[PDB]
Design a protein around this motif. Structure first.
Motif, PDB file in Angstrom:
ATOM      1  N   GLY A  80       0.797  -1.225   0.000  1.00 43.22           N
ATOM      2  CA  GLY A  80       0.000   0.000   0.000  1.00 43.22           C
ATOM      3  C   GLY A  80       0.841   1.293   0.000  1.00 43.22           C
ATOM      4  O   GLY A  80       0.348   2.379   0.344  1.00 43.22           O
ATOM      5  N   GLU A  81       2.088   1.204  -0.467  1.00 38.69           N
ATOM      6  CA  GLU A  81       3.008   2.339  -0.515  1.00 38.69           C
ATOM      7  C   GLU A  81       2.832   3.191  -1.784  1.00 38.69           C
ATOM      8  O   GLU A  81       2.683   2.655  -2.908  1.00 38.69           O
ATOM      9  CB  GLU A  81       4.473   1.887  -0.484  1.00 38.69           C
ATOM     10  CG  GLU A  81       4.969   1.398   0.889  1.00 38.69           C
ATOM     11  CD  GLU A  81       5.220   2.494   1.910  1.00 38.69           C
ATOM     12  OE1 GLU A  81       4.720   3.615   1.709  1.00 38.69           O
ATOM     13  OE2 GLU A  81       5.955   2.228   2.895  1.00 38.69           O
ATOM     14  N   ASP A  82       2.962   4.526  -1.595  1.00 39.63           N
ATOM     15  CA  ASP A  82       3.295   5.406  -2.711  1.00 39.63           C
ATOM     16  C   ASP A  82       4.613   6.094  -2.396  1.00 39.63           C
ATOM     17  O   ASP A  82       5.648   5.655  -2.880  1.00 39.63           O
ATOM     18  CB  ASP A  82       2.171   6.369  -3.088  1.00 39.63           C
ATOM     19  CG  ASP A  82       2.449   7.082  -4.410  1.00 39.63           C
ATOM     20  OD1 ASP A  82       2.874   6.400  -5.371  1.00 39.63           O
ATOM     21  OD2 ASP A  82       2.265   8.328  -4.465  1.00 39.63           O
ATOM     22  N   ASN A  83       4.570   7.109  -1.524  1.00 41.36           N
ATOM     23  CA  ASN A  83       5.777   7.755  -1.067  1.00 41.36           C
ATOM     24  C   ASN A  83       6.405   6.849  -0.012  1.00 41.36           C
ATOM     25  O   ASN A  83       5.833   6.695   1.058  1.00 41.36           O
ATOM     26  CB  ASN A  83       5.488   9.145  -0.514  1.00 41.36           C
ATOM     27  CG  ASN A  83       6.760   9.883  -0.193  1.00 41.36           C
ATOM     28  OD1 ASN A  83       7.719   9.336   0.356  1.00 41.36           O
ATOM     29  ND2 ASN A  83       6.803  11.143  -0.604  1.00 41.36           N
ATOM     30  N   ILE A  84       7.567   6.237  -0.285  1.00 38.53           N
ATOM     31  CA  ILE A  84       8.115   5.257   0.636  1.00 38.53           C
ATOM     32  C   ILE A  84       8.756   5.931   1.853  1.00 38.53           C
ATOM     33  O   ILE A  84       9.126   5.228   2.800  1.00 38.53           O
ATOM     34  CB  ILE A  84       9.154   4.303  -0.005  1.00 38.53           C
ATOM     35  CG1 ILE A  84      10.222   5.055  -0.803  1.00 38.53           C
ATOM     36  CG2 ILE A  84       8.457   3.165  -0.754  1.00 38.53           C
ATOM     37  CD1 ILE A  84      11.440   4.171  -1.090  1.00 38.53           C
ATOM     38  N   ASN A  85       8.900   7.263   1.817  1.00 42.63           N
ATOM     39  CA  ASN A  85       9.549   7.980   2.901  1.00 42.63           C
ATOM     40  C   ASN A  85       8.543   8.642   3.845  1.00 42.63           C
ATOM     41  O   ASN A  85       8.960   9.177   4.858  1.00 42.63           O
ATOM     42  CB  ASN A  85      10.528   9.028   2.388  1.00 42.63           C
ATOM     43  CG  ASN A  85      11.762   8.394   1.788  1.00 42.63           C
ATOM     44  OD1 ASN A  85      12.329   7.484   2.387  1.00 42.63           O
ATOM     45  ND2 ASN A  85      12.189   8.897   0.645  1.00 42.63           N
ATOM     46  N   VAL A  86       7.245   8.627   3.526  1.00 38.33           N
ATOM     47  CA  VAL A  86       6.220   9.272   4.337  1.00 38.33           C
ATOM     48  C   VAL A  86       5.082   8.307   4.571  1.00 38.33           C
ATOM     49  O   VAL A  86       4.601   7.725   3.610  1.00 38.33           O
ATOM     50  CB  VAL A  86       5.656  10.548   3.663  1.00 38.33           C
ATOM     51  CG1 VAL A  86       4.533  11.170   4.471  1.00 38.33           C
ATOM     52  CG2 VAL A  86       6.770  11.560   3.423  1.00 38.33           C
ATOM     53  N   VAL A  87       4.625   8.222   5.833  1.00 35.72           N
ATOM     54  CA  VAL A  87       3.435   7.433   6.110  1.00 35.72           C
ATOM     55  C   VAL A  87       2.190   8.221   5.694  1.00 35.72           C
ATOM     56  O   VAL A  87       1.882   9.243   6.324  1.00 35.72           O
ATOM     57  CB  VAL A  87       3.363   6.954   7.572  1.00 35.72           C
ATOM     58  CG1 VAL A  87       2.027   6.277   7.855  1.00 35.72           C
ATOM     59  CG2 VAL A  87       4.515   6.042   7.901  1.00 35.72           C
ATOM     60  N   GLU A  88       1.457   7.724   4.670  1.00 34.74           N
ATOM     61  CA  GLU A  88       0.352   8.464   4.069  1.00 34.74           C
ATOM     62  C   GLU A  88      -1.013   7.915   4.496  1.00 34.74           C
ATOM     63  O   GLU A  88      -2.037   8.560   4.245  1.00 34.74           O
ATOM     64  CB  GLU A  88       0.448   8.460   2.540  1.00 34.74           C
ATOM     65  CG  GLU A  88       1.700   9.142   2.017  1.00 34.74           C
ATOM     66  CD  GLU A  88       1.899   9.134   0.506  1.00 34.74           C
ATOM     67  OE1 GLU A  88       2.276   8.092  -0.079  1.00 34.74           O
ATOM     68  OE2 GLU A  88       1.708  10.191  -0.095  1.00 34.74           O
ATOM     69  N   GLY A  89      -1.040   6.707   5.068  1.00 29.60           N
ATOM     70  CA  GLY A  89      -2.224   6.201   5.751  1.00 29.60           C
ATOM     71  C   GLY A  89      -2.756   4.871   5.202  1.00 29.60           C
ATOM     72  O   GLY A  89      -3.682   4.316   5.811  1.00 29.60           O
ATOM     73  N   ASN A  90      -2.262   4.404   4.039  1.00 28.36           N
ATOM     74  CA  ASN A  90      -2.825   3.215   3.409  1.00 28.36           C
ATOM     75  C   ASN A  90      -1.854   2.040   3.449  1.00 28.36           C
ATOM     76  O   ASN A  90      -2.130   0.979   2.888  1.00 28.36           O
ATOM     77  CB  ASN A  90      -3.248   3.511   1.977  1.00 28.36           C
ATOM     78  CG  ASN A  90      -4.368   4.530   1.977  1.00 28.36           C
ATOM     79  OD1 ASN A  90      -5.351   4.336   2.688  1.00 28.36           O
ATOM     80  ND2 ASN A  90      -4.210   5.612   1.229  1.00 28.36           N
ATOM     81  N   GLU A  91      -0.744   2.227   4.174  1.00 26.05           N
ATOM     82  CA  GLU A  91       0.269   1.183   4.234  1.00 26.05           C
ATOM     83  C   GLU A  91      -0.130   0.043   5.188  1.00 26.05           C
ATOM     84  O   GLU A  91      -0.831   0.224   6.191  1.00 26.05           O
ATOM     85  CB  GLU A  91       1.608   1.721   4.738  1.00 26.05           C
ATOM     86  CG  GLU A  91       2.177   2.876   3.945  1.00 26.05           C
ATOM     87  CD  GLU A  91       1.771   4.309   4.274  1.00 26.05           C
ATOM     88  OE1 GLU A  91       0.779   4.505   5.009  1.00 26.05           O
ATOM     89  OE2 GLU A  91       2.427   5.224   3.744  1.00 26.05           O
ATOM     90  N   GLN A  92       0.438  -1.128   4.880  1.00 29.96           N
ATOM     91  CA  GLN A  92       0.462  -2.274   5.756  1.00 29.96           C
ATOM     92  C   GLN A  92       1.906  -2.738   5.815  1.00 29.96           C
ATOM     93  O   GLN A  92       2.484  -3.008   4.761  1.00 29.96           O
ATOM     94  CB  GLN A  92      -0.447  -3.374   5.208  1.00 29.96           C
ATOM     95  CG  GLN A  92      -1.918  -2.978   5.187  1.00 29.96           C
ATOM     96  CD  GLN A  92      -2.804  -4.061   4.633  1.00 29.96           C
ATOM     97  OE1 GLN A  92      -2.717  -5.228   5.061  1.00 29.96           O
ATOM     98  NE2 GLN A  92      -3.706  -3.663   3.745  1.00 29.96           N
TER      99      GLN A  92
END
Ligand code: CA
Length: 223
Positions: free
Chosen positions: A51-63
């Motif tokens: 669920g990554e886009d920007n790998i350097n910022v937690v954007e809310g959709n990651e697992q």
């Protein structure tokens, strides 16, 4: 990815980042518990990031899920990169949703001329070094085996194919390794190797996933 475009957030929902304190390779989610990558990306202590886009910022959709096991192909040769494929099992199942989704395995191999989608967080320059923060994408065609073999005499096995542009300028690169090559909605390749990136007469070389479907299915049924 050199000479590509910004994918757009979560438009490649099967793309994963492998993290060992830093992003070091890509991967593809093939069901809720399994990721396919390149054997040459093997290391211990992998965390899978979905669920990554920007790998350097937690954007809310990651697992973020730790690997419980890594399985390198039994015939992987690190010298020739023949059989450059590995399976990673997650410690817990991913929640599949619109931003995190599996990619289908092929039932048949892809054809020369088919335009595929290659994605990753790797180097964006062909000379020099610049790593992006957001996911990059490239549309690239599968090349004929004759042109592939001509580009890399003595090095191409039947478990490899070439995709890209003989004129140069567009290619996958360091840091995209292990990530997906999707053609007609199937995972047909894994980013494997090449001489530099986006060099003239030196296209990308990809693991030919359709040769491994039996091994993948058997492995997953027993681990
Ligand atoms: Ca992020």
């Amino acid at each position: 990815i050199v000479g590509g475009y910004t994918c757009g957030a979560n438009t490649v929902p099967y793309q994963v980042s492998l993290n060992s304190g830093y992003h070091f390779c890509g991967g593809s989610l093939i069901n809720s518990q399994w990721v396919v990558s390149a054997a040459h990306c093997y290391k211990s202590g992998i965390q899978v990031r979905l669920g990554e886009d920007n790998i350097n910022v937690v954007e809310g959709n990651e697992q973020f899920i730790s690997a419980s096991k890594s399985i390198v192909h039994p015939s992987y040769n690190s010298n020739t990169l023949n059989n450059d494929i590995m399976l990673i099992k997650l410690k817990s199942a991913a929640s599949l949703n619109s931003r995190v989704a599996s990619i289908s395995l092929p039932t048949s191999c892809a054809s020369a001329g088919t335009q595929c989608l290659i994605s990753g967080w790797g180097n964006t320059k062909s000379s020099g070094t610049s790593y992006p923060d957001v996911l990059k994408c490239l549309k690239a065609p599968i090349l004929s085996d004759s042109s592939c073999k001509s580009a890399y005499p003595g090095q191409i096995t039947s478990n490899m194919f070439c995709a890209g542009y003989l004129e140069g300028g567009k290619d996958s690169c360091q840091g995209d390794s292990g990530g997906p090559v999707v053609c007609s909605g199937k995972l047909q390749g894994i980013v494997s190797w090449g001489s530099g990136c986006a060099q003239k007469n030196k296209p990308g070389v990809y693991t030919k996933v359709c040769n491994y479907v039996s091994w993948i299915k058997q492995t997953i049924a027993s681990n």
